Structure 1
Amino acid sequence: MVTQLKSASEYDSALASGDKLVVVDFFATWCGPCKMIAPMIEKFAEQYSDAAFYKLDVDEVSDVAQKAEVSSMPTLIFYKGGKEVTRVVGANPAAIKQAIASNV
């Protein structure tokens, strides 16, 4: 399943009592994987049974991107215990399966 984070509440409450797998995606659609991998991760979303896909850009939100400083392209992270433990900031689809399928 794919989610759309419009309000910080959807993100905050997700890191609090969020035991399941909480995935985040920070990409301002510059040019490259950020747009080429969109279908990949978005497509894999229909593969998992309990994977929270949090989509975030920059201006569209301005809340998360503000606090959660981005240092990649794109920038994906995995939250299991309300704390970034298994992050994945690079560029590779397969990295989502072995990642999501792990924390799942």
Structure 2
Amino acid sequence: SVKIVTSQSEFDSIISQNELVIVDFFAEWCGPCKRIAPFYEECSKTYTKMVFIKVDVDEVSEVTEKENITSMPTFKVYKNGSSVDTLLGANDSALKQLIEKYAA
């Protein structure tokens, strides 16, 4: 169950309250963006050791500035409340290997 956080601090909070956190910075008008969620959901079930959340750029622009979100869709894994890995474009297979690396 991917988590949807609409607050700026809530987003940052998730990042710091866990050892490993994977969050997909994505935006509401693309087919892939929504399309990557279904696979993301599967990944959240086996990878339940890693915390999965979703944060849009429109509702929380401040979030974009926090990680300087430049290329979307962007999938970044956070370790110890910080950056660790970056994935360009939302692919089920690309994330499979990315999420698998820390989450397996």
Q: Quick check: which one's strand share is greater?
A: 2
What percent of counterpart residues are identical? Answer: 48
Mind listing any 5+ residue stretches in structure 1 that lack a counterpart? none
Query: Could you tell me how far apart the structure 1 residues matched to 2:47 and 2:61 are?
Result: 29
Runs of 4+ off more than 6 Å: none
Query: Quick check: which one's helix share is greater?
Result: 2
After superposition, give the CA deviation of every residue in 1:38-72 in whole Å (9 maximum; x if it has no partner): 21112322232222112111232333124333222
Once the two structures are superposed, what CA deviation does each residue of 1:10-32 show, in whole Å capped at 9, x if it has no partner? 3223333521x201111213323
d(CA) in 2 for partners of 1:73, 1:103 = 21
Aligned length: 103
Provide the residue aligned with 1:14 in structure 2. Answer: 14
Letter in 1 for 2:33: C
TM-score (normalizing by structure 1): 0.77
Q: Indicate the RMSD between aligned Cα atoms, in angstroms.
A: 2.1
Structure 2 residues not aligned, in runs of 5+? none
Q: Normalising to structure 2: TM-score of the pair? A: 0.77
Of stretches 68-77 and 1-10 in structure 1, the one that deviates more from structure 2 is 1-10
